[PDB]
Symmetry: C2
Subunit: 396 residues, 2 copies
């Protein structure tokens, strides 16, 4: 039934909160932590010049093959090969998409049929469950036991993954670094994921969107380079939307399995034809930015990461994993005198802070909220202090 299918995809007012609100607002600059601030951390220098050169070049840029401009795919494949530590095939193993979201949609569409079991991590990216269920697959959840003082692994329940595959799951989709928690899977976790997938003949979609924004002294392991895994059963997706602040151009890529990439190409034709022709041109600069630019960017984000962690952990009932790549923090809040959903509204009403409710990522992370901390440094820190002040005001 079309109606039920789509039901599953579904100023701040005080209405319904009048008996619950305590005190007056806390003055300060509003911060929307729901996504990155591309004014505080600008799009790659040079990107707009590349876009402008493409427009001037004209119809050759405006129209491309459905899988993406050939010249740009040929430029990108060596860069993406060097980054991930395994071969990339420009011609048949690489598609350019409308955002990494574009790639994710296509990748799930090309791999999940009606009734197929799909292993999905909890917590993980908001679209993952919704995609599986839109294509009438059956999610088999795999717990991420990320709540731990042991920060040498993400905490994936690998026995749970294996059991998912024993039960008939032939697809596994995950983000690395994890959105929302910012944890990165260890070498051993990725090795076992690779071995389990190969063992059961499962396809893996590895969403490495934020994997380039990797903090000093964090390790990162690319599933697609594992000796245990068959390269032709892995699709890796990533792009420049967040690390490089190019979200406004709407670009992503997917690479790996030729059979799956060929399916994603055929589908892209009828989903949106192509990634915007003119947008594609900015990818000529991707992984070829000025020396030290990415390194400074990672350093500026790491300073924000560390001060936000100091402020949040300063609150006695708050737990948060250290993010190891990307710009997400996922603090678990204490018992409050209001429900989690009510507190999110109250943060906006009384602190001018937007945060993402933890229920977007799993039904079992309801008392967490997600922050995207790619923000103005000082505004972000001041906002965080308002959050914890309100956590104290509403503490059960």
């Amino acid at each position: 039934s079309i109606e039920a299918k789509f039901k599953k995809l579904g100023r701040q007012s005080a209405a319904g909160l009048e008996a619950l609100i305590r005190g007056a607002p806390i003055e300060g600059r509003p911060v929307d932590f729901s996504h990155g601030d591309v004014d505080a951390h600008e799009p790659t220098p040079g990107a707009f010049d590349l876009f402008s050169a493409g427009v001037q070049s004209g119809g050759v840029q405006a129209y491309t093959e459905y899988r993406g401009d050939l010249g740009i795919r040929d430029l990108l494949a060596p860069r993406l090969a060097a980054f991930t530590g395994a071969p990339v095939d420009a011609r048949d193993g690489l598609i350019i998409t409308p955002g990494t979201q574009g790639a994710l949609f296509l990748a799930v569409a090309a791999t999940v049929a009606r009734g197929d079991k799909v292993a999905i991590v909890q917590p993980d990216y908001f679209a993952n469950r919704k995609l599986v269920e839109f294509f009438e697959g059956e999610m088999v959840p795999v717990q991420l036991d990320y709540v731990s003082a042991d920060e040498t692994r993400a905490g994936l329940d690998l026995t749970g993954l294996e059991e998912a595959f024993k039960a008939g799951a032939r697809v596994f989709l995950f983000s690395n670094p994890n959105n929302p928690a910012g944890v990165v899977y260890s070498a051993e976790e990725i090795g076992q994921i690779a071995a389990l997938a190969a063992r059961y003949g499962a396809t893996v979609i590895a969403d490495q969107l934020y994997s380039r924004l990797r903090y000093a002294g964090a390790s990162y392991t690319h599933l697609r380079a594992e000796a245990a895994v068959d390269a032709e059963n892995v699709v890796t997706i990533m792009g420049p939307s967040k690390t490089e602040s190019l979200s406004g151009y709407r670009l992503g890529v997917a690479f790996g399995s030729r059979a799956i990439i060929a399916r994603m190409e055929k589908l892209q034709a009828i989903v949106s034809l192509r990634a915007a022709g003119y947008s594609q041109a900015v990818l000529r600069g991707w992984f070829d930015e000025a020396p030290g630019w990415m390194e400074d960017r990672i350093a500026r984000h790491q300073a924000i990461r560390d001060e936000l962690l100091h402020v949040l952990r300063g609150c006695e009932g708050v737990f948060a994993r250290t993010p190891q790549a990307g710009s997400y923090l996922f603090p678990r809040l204490p018992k409050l005198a209001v429900a989690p959903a009510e507190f999110v509204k109250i943060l906006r009403l009384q602190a001018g802070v937007v945060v993402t409710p933890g229920t977007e990522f799993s039904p079992h992370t309801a008392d967490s909220v997600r922050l995207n901390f790619s923000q103005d440094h000082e505004a972000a820190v001041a906002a965080a202090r308002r959050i914890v002040t309100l956590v104290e005001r509403y503490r059960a």
Copy 2:
């Protein structure tokens, strides 16, 4: 089966004589060097990038300010109200709108009425969502140019058989014919009578030739505005395809479903691209008129050349830049003749099988091209038809 599902989404001995040389022309899509993107569109994109994060990120359904600008423009154009808040979505191209509109209206097993010939995606989308296409013949091969030639009895019978969606392009891609006031009035009356939803793909409806009428389905008194979705955008007429922008408007129920799905298909139309829509339907006085006049001259000359060959038929395009000539019996197959036109004339045309299984002896040209190059290429096409004539 997933393999079977995606399977549906897909000379030397025969050569006569030497090639014919001349400037090559790709008629498979429009030439936006010959017919430039709207003046000022790039300045809008640039000002939007300068404005920064407020433009890079929008609501999934599209920038609100831009939806508010567009709704009265689309209302004046189509002649019926447009609801910017709950009745209008900005998509990645009109293709993007088409995908979401079919997804939002076609469940597994549903009968969907589809025109033959029509746009390449229409059959593929219905089949991707496991709908059952019920075909409706367009009898466009006629000297009568007062109507497109849709089999309205066939449409009614589709609805009698249980079809509750009807999707069609107007002007028709590939033939370029526009549905008459009577044809559109009757599609509205039939849809209302059977409670069917209609998706009106009016992508090329703005490039309307002088002396041609155009009738908007969504303005028909007989039709329920809440069971119509109209899709269009600036990709072809305005040469903005490279920004990847379309809109859908109409039914609040269906548009809501489209917005929810867009969130997981691609999040949004590219935030920076969206800025260029601030100029759409606000181009300088005379600009659209001049563009139509330039295209109409191309149209007329290409028709003169193509019809000069005895065995060629083509309907006069009434809106948009598509011609769809039917070719005589050749000593080679149609598929082979398209390869020969490339190799011996430097001409790319689109095979008629993209649009219907029963128009294999036709080819589609997009004639939004350099005028002189386009006419010289047409002459090469006709020379080779004569050379290969069975």
